[PDB]
Design an enzyme around this catalytic site. Structure first.
Site, short mmCIF file in Angstrom:
data_model
loop_
_atom_site.label_atom_id
_atom_site.label_comp_id
_atom_site.label_asym_id
_atom_site.label_seq_id
_atom_site.Cartn_x
_atom_site.Cartn_y
_atom_site.Cartn_z
N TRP A 253 0.86 -1.35 -0.34
CA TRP A 253 -0.32 0.31 -0.07
C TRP A 253 1.15 1.70 -0.27
CZ3 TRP A 253 -0.16 3.49 3.83
CH2 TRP A 253 0.63 3.19 5.03
N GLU B 11 4.52 8.67 15.10
CA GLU B 11 5.38 8.10 14.05
C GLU B 11 6.00 9.27 13.03
OE1 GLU B 11 5.33 5.23 12.64
OE2 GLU B 11 3.23 4.36 13.32
N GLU C 66 8.39 2.31 7.70
CA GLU C 66 7.58 3.31 8.84
C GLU C 66 7.74 4.42 7.77
OE1 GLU C 66 7.11 3.12 11.92
OE2 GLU C 66 7.11 0.58 11.32
N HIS D 116 4.00 5.53 7.02
CA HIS D 116 3.08 5.85 8.37
C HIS D 116 2.45 6.47 8.52
CE1 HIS D 116 3.99 1.84 9.97
NE2 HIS D 116 3.82 1.60 8.69
N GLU E 13 7.12 -1.70 18.81
CA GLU E 13 5.95 -2.42 17.58
C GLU E 13 5.00 -2.87 18.50
OE1 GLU E 13 6.03 -2.01 14.64
OE2 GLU E 13 8.49 -1.25 13.60
N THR F 13 1.86 -0.12 19.35
CA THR F 13 1.88 0.50 18.53
C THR F 13 1.38 -0.01 17.68
OG1 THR F 13 3.01 2.77 16.79
CG2 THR F 13 3.89 0.65 16.28
N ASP G 65 0.79 -3.93 9.56
CA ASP G 65 2.44 -3.59 9.33
C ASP G 65 3.05 -3.55 10.36
OD1 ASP G 65 1.81 -3.27 6.85
OD2 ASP G 65 3.10 -0.63 6.99
N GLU G 66 2.51 -3.23 11.77
CA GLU G 66 3.30 -3.18 13.07
C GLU G 66 3.26 -4.51 13.90
OE1 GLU G 66 4.94 -0.52 12.75
OE2 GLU G 66 2.83 1.34 13.54
N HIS H 14 6.23 -5.90 11.59
CA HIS H 14 7.75 -5.45 12.20
C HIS H 14 7.52 -6.25 13.51
CE1 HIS H 14 6.84 -2.15 9.78
NE2 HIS H 14 7.57 -2.92 9.26
FE LIG Z 1 6.60 -0.36 12.42
FE LIG Z 2 5.46 3.03 12.61
#
Ligand SMILES: [Fe+3]
Ligand SMILES: [Fe+3]
Ligand SMILES: [Fe+3]
Ligand SMILES: [Fe+3]
Lengths: 311, 311
Positions: free
Chosen positions: B28, B71, B109, B112, B157, B160, B189-190, B193
């Protein structure tokens, strides 16, 4: 010895370099140059922007995308200059002035890509999806000698001050006064940055002429080279006059003069070989200026149509 | 020895950690979740967004600003994890897999803060000028042990992923399905991560239990603490249920379990003191959960009215 040179500079970095920072209170922010989203006039302001920007030639759109891609890559440029250093003394722990500068400078830099990115987005003139991909690839891409970063950034700040300045001037020439303001305001930040970084290099030449000369010769030879997608940005900046082969050579002569590289004394044989190499470059690069111009004049946007948005 | 531990992990980082990256092609981009600026429908899409976002409570606006500020500070978080390392062998120079991961992760990152920043801008609901200042101060602010960064980022991570996920869920509950998508996509995503970073820490516990335990005890004691402007973000996340004292304690128990910190063996006396400290924390933090809730319920936005934009 390089570590110690850097350590011994703390007081002077504090006294001479940190004042080149502009206080956050007195600082512009991207919101200053954008339609006011809190206002009943928002939609109308956005429309004015889109009207103003429909007057911009394609070459100009591309150079501006070039500039934003470069700026938006900020996480991968500040990383070399990041120093995992912190001083201990009777007041306790504190940050090295080098880190205070890098951090505050990074905070300055962060606004450059944001303003251009939101402005281009709102204009509708470029395909921001394709450009965001490009930027992700580019951050993902992103020698350890600690002088190198300082030298490179001196050159880069002068090049980017001149390029954003000339982009601004051309936006002005087309009557796009808000975009001119943006480009010109960034240029003025870069002129300050360039001043801080050139002074650092100056000081390195003063304190360690031998180390600095070898690093500069390395940088000219390896890293900093005469100004496919990046080639295309480069060609467009050439034909627009924003950033040319002649200007690259002019930056090299200015740095040679500013730092007195052709006037260094007490160098070893190795140092003099490095000094001779660097000081002979402007004569070498004059010769290829007229060829850079011809090459740029043949470039087609057809392979790059993906950059463009609404017409 | 820590340097060597890190060196000896290259193959496993390549084989086990790099696959947690999502290919840029399949990724994305912010533009995906924003009004289409290339479209004749742009203004109408921007209006829909502004309508959708007028339904959002103030607490929700603030938490979302909290998340973006966090972020947007990305340049100062990737810097610790930046390793000035490059491997030499028969294929030539190459990047250490640690740096390949950090760079690509930084590129992830970077999207974000951009998506949330442009979305909040377009909504008109917050004063982006004041928030940009805040962010400049914050990047300007920005122990050298190399395990510390990995541990901290594991925790961060997971925190968040949970916070953006819960923000998304609340946006959904209010019918703001585009904002829910944004928050939920970031959360996913997090979650990736968090998985990569927890596995790194796991591996550090496997290869160097003594070093890792001492680092973790340091991090719990010094850096990672129970979840005025940041206090206010914290209070709002508490009362909204997005990120609470109970969730902080739950993250500590999960990490203790995941890495088997209460099951380590062969530790020195020093190691066991560090293990006992860490493993006793959840019992200590349960006791202050009910007080965190009461405190959050008394917070006023009046000192923070500067955050808000159009009503
Ligand atoms: Fe992250
Ligand atoms: Fe982030
Ligand atoms: Fe810049
Ligand atoms: Fe700059």
């Amino acid at each position: 010895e390089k570590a110690e040179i850097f350590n011994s500079m703390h007081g002077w970095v504090e006294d001479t370099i940190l004042p080149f920072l502009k206080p956050v209170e007195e600082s512009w922010q991207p919101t200053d140059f954008l339609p006011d989203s809190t206002s009943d006039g928002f939609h109308e302001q956005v429309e004015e922007l889109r009207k103003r920007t429909a007057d911009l030639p394609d070459d100009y759109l591309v150079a501006l995308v070039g500039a934003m891609v470069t700026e938006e890559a900020l996480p991968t440029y500040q990383t070399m200059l990041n120093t995992t250093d912190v001083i201990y003394d009777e007041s306790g722990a504190s940050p090295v002035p080098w880190a205070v500068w890098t951090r505050a400078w990074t905070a300055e830099e962060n606004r450059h890509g944001d303003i251009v990115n939101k402005y281009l987005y709102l204009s509708g003139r470029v395909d921001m999806k394709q450009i965001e991909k490009t930027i992700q690839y580019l951050i993902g891409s992103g020698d350890n000698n600690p002088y190198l970063a300082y030298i490179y950034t001196s050159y880069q700040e002068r090049a980017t001050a001149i390029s954003h300045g000339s982009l601004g001037r051309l936006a002005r020439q087309k009557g796009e006064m808000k975009l001119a303001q943006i480009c010109g305001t960034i240029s003025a930040d870069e002129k300050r940055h360039e001043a801080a970084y050139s002074k650092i290099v100056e000081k390195l030449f003063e304190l360690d002429p031998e180390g600095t000369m070898l690093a500069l010769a390395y940088m000219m030879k390896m890293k900093i080279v005469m100004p496919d997608m990046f080639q295309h940005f480069s060609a467009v900046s050439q034909r627009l006059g924003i950033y040319t082969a002649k200007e690259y050579t002019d930056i090299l002569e200015h740095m040679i003069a500013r730092w007195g590289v052709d006037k260094l004394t007490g160098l070893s044989g190795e140092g003099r070989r490095a000094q001779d190499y660097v000081c002979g470059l402007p004569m070498r690069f004059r010769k290829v200026e007229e060829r850079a111009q011809a090459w740029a004049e043949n470039i087609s946007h057809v392979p790059f149509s993906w950059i463009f948005g609404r017409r």
